[PDB]
């Protein structure tokens, strides 16, 4: 859920109106956005770090707007204002054209040492930007916004903005040994080496992540220029020499990474977003990127796709019956400049490079409906008769639940995850003989394995309810996982009905009687000479010897009936003795 903070007064000024805290909260809703909150850093630093009451330009009235992780052209104020502006037809949607410069055909060359750490990269420049205190921060913000978001913390794509007036001549993208590049990084006193920064950063709260999470290979990405100046070391930090500040006139933007198209997009977003501030408004100065391939492609490629969709489709899909001429109007307000094609049947839609989310015909429908306003769509009810059916298992379960309750027991809600010791050690068995499934890199200890039985959880429940009266009679009918070599995934769930008797004395006879009831309920006759069930004394490492049995029915072992062994009852920090029961109700269907 990408959030975008914006100076209110500015936002309003940007639009050309003043909004009530409702009027805007409404406009947000109307456009799929959400006005999450209205506060300021007077609430930020004032809530988790001592109390630095620093307010001179921090404590303000800014809106905390939530935006769909889908729309990228909405990660900065420039974008939200542009979007909402066209959405309410208060402005015509701007066109983004990339132009050729006057000889200074800036170029960035990719080498061979590249393809294996950050395969490709792309760049472009935007001439004479009239920056501002805010415009600057917005430009930097957007950069961060789509970095640790759409780029997956720079992992795939990394963007670098440079002050073109502080370097010149063809730039080079390549990779050299770590300890083979001196550098004067953004906020660093001296001038260090790549092999040197890497570890001096393992302590940097911000970059502590980005680095190793991406580099520790035989080469490191780097960008040079004619002079031999180091532009930046792509994923980690940029050069302080080419740093960009409020007074920068020309910006050279470069994007390197493992995912071509994404980078290609990130560029377009950045450049298309801020070209609103270039002298030659909404223009991006081409740039020539030369691949190891030896070929030269121009960037950014402000892609303008032109797919076609039939009007009847939009209607038949959304659930509205508007005319093609009006449908076009809708789509337009959404940035997708549409125009009806003569026979008022088909609508020609122009997909701007800003809305890179439109990838299928249906995506147009989305925008179409959003423009039309969801709540203006008449609710209709699908007229197809279908007979409902419960899932055999669950039906039975639902029944047993009602009788367990009739039989005086109380249903619980055990978690499905826990610690190995819960389903092994504490029960007198090694985690190697449980057939249990193991969770990778589990947060807590109680996230190691997935239930193999309901007995643990049930006990643990008693443990937390010591405050409860004389005999506790718990039960639960849920699933337990097991490894199964014969299932597409590797594991299988089983429906166990598990109950427990907690009292001064274990109710092993009353628990034995529960099983008898259950069987009686399932119409399963006692004895085997009729395909029924029987109790055959047996031994269990979790049951006090000689007070443990096995349940057999419909030609197989169903469960274990018995009195919990003093060891398990203490290892689960309990007082009284305990009688349990756990049958797999599966075979009884």
């Amino acid at each position: 859920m990408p959030t975008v903070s914006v100076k209110r007064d500015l936002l309003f000024q940007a639009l050309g109106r003043t909004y009530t805290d409702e009027e805007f909260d409404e406009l947000c809703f109307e456009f799929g956005l959400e006005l999450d909150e209205i506060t300021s850093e007077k609430e930020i630093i004032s809530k988790e770090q001592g109390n630095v009451k620093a307010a001179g330009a921090s404590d303000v009235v800014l809106y905390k707007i939530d935006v769909p992780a889908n729309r990228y052209d909405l990660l900065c104020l420039e974008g939200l204002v542009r979007g909402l502006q066209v959405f309410k037809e208060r402005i015509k949607a701007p066109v983004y054209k990339r132009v050729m410069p006057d000889g200074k055909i800036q170029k960035l060359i990719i080498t061979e040492e590249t393809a294996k750490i950050r395969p490709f990269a792309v760049a472009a420049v935007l001439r004479n930007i009239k920056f501002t205190k805010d415009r600057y921060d917005s430009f930097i913000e957007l950069q961060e916004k789509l970095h640790q978001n759409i780029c997956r913390k720079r992992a795939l794509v990394a963007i670098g903005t440079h002050d073109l007036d502080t370097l010149s001549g063809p730039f080079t993208y390549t990779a050299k040994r770590p300890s083979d590049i001196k550098f004067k990084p953004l906020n660093k006193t001296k001038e260090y080496t790549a092999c040197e920064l890497m570890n001096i950063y393992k302590t940097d709260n911000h970059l502590k992540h980005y680095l190793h999470i991406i580099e520790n290979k035989p080469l490191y990405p780097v960008i040079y220029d004619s002079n031999g100046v180091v532009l930046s070391m792509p994923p980690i930090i940029n050069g302080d020499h080419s740093r960009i500040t409020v007074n920068t006139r020309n910006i050279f933007i470069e994007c390197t990474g493992t995912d071509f198209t994404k980078a290609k997009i990130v560029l377009d977003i950045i450049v298309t977003m801020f070209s609103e501030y270039c002298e030659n408004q909404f223009t991006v100065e081409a740039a020539e990127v030369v691949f190891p391939n030896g070929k030269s492609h121009t960037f950014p490629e402000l892609a303008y796709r032109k797919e076609m969709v039939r009007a009847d489709l939009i209607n038949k899909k959304v659930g509205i019956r508007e005319t093609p001429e009006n449908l076009a109007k809708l789509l337009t307000r959404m940035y997708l400049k549409s125009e009806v094609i003569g026979d008022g049947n088909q609508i020609e839609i122009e997909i701007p490079p800003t809305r890179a989310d439109i990838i299928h015909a249906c995506d147009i429908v989305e925008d179409a409906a959003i423009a039309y306003g969801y709540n203006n769509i008449q609710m209709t009810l699908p007229k197809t008769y279908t007979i409902a059916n419960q899932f055999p298992l669950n039906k039975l379960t639902e029944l047993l639940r009602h009788d367990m309750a009739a039989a005086g027991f109380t249903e619980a809600l055990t978690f499905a995850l826990c610690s190995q010791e819960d389903i092994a050690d504490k029960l007198g068995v090694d985690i190697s003989a449980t057939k249990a499934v193991h969770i990778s890199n589990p947060k807590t200890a109680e996230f190691q394995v997935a239930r193999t039985t309901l007995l643990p959880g049930l006990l643990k429940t008693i443990a937390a309810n010591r405050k409860m009266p004389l005999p506790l009679k718990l039960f639960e009918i849920s699933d337990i996982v097991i490894k199964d070599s014969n299932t597409d995934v590797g594991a299988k769930n089983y429906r166990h009905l598990c109950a427990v008797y907690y009292n001064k004395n274990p109710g092993f006879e009353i628990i034995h009687g529960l099983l008898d009831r259950i069987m009686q309920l399932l119409d399963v006759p006692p004895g085997e000479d009729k395909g029924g069930y029987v109790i055959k004394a047996s031994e269990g490492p979790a049951f006090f010897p000689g007070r443990c049995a096995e349940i057999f029915a419909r030609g197989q072992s169903v469960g274990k009936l018995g009195v919990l062994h003093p060891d398990v009852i203490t290892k689960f920090e309990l007082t009284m003795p305990c009688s349990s029961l756990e049958i797999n109700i599966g075979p009884f269907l």
Partner: protein, 508 residues
Amino acid sequence: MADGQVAELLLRRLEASDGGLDSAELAAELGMEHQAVVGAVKSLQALGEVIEAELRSTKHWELTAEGEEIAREGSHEARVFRSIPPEGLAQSELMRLPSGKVGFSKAMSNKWIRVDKSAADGPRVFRVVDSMEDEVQRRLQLVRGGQAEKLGEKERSELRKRKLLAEVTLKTYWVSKGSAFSTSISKQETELSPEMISSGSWRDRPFKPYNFLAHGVLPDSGHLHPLLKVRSQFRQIFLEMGFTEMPTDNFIESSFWNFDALFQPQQHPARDQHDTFFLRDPAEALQLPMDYVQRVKRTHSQGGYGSQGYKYNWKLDEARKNLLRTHTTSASARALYRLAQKKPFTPVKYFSIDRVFRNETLDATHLAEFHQIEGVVADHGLTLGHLMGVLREFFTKLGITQLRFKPAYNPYTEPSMEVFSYHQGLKKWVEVGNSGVFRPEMLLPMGLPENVSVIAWGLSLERPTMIKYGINNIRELVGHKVNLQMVYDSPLCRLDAEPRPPPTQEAA
């Protein structure tokens, strides 16, 4: 000294009397009223079957405070009739005084006077007839002549509610001697043995009367967990709406079905170690629909079926990664794929309520595993409006009408919408459910026909249960830390989970 003191004394008397005794007379003979003798006789009956008593009663007719006035100064209608000349009498002033007002309403419902609006002096009242006979009054005028009988039951009847007189009934008690009679009073007789029934020994003793104040003994009823009591109600709503219950026996899902199958890109954040619990043991799926998988891999990276894919490289080794089902949507993917293989396509309605597992140590109720219910409809030409229509019907059987839809985003839905509801108490539009319309790049590769479209919606069993049983935090009954006492007491959240439940009074 009111019951027990006038009791042991009313017993003395009965003992000294020749049978008969009145709670009135013997109360007149005493320095006590009749709210003491009678007030006590009650105790002398509770205390077993000591003394018999007969509630005799006197019945005479009296006149009202109000009706005593009428009784002498005539009724209110007659009052006003005579007060209004032929010259008319602006009804303005007439009703500018209660005494009249009333009488005007009846000189009207008598056809004795009528109105008009033909004189600048606002509406006016003129008498209709000229013959006046005050029945109301000349009827009471005699009821107080000790003649309260020369009148019809048809008459005093209406007269009664008119507050023009009431009936008086003096209750007298004739306490006799029963059996248990004895001044010993040793109410040590606690209950009622099966013996006494067959014998008669219930008649020869006093039984300690019961203390109807204290609550009784709640029986040891079994109990069903509140959250599941709710799961049940949802399950039912779905069945009543023609939906079939799809199976969910698989806490462990292969990454393919959980994410890829649903056209949720591989490099999606949601399939990160911080978001989803992956598996350490059956870390690799032992099998999967390679054909279907191929069609996915394809459209996923190169596109097709009308889409332009995500233009990235789809790694199969990734999809092979096993995990803990993060959402029931995967179950639907399964269900739909299966459906896509049916000889001829056949429209359906599936639903399923099963627990999912999310890693997030996230805010809100800290639950890394919670229940999620999902409903899906697959037919020909379903529209966003249908999705809406179905949603309205669903949330209605849940008792909700304040429904407003909002645009949203789900990797696997052409249009997607979140649906909200305005909360009364907690004034503010709260959510209530997320829904969409599965993208064709999800469906088409499964093999479903292009003319078929499927819509779906979902929510968590937890959120609503919190606002139905009424709570704020749910880790209060979801887990081993559950407060069993709260379960024992959890009421029917069924009639009180659809119909209108009553909230505590508001005394000021």
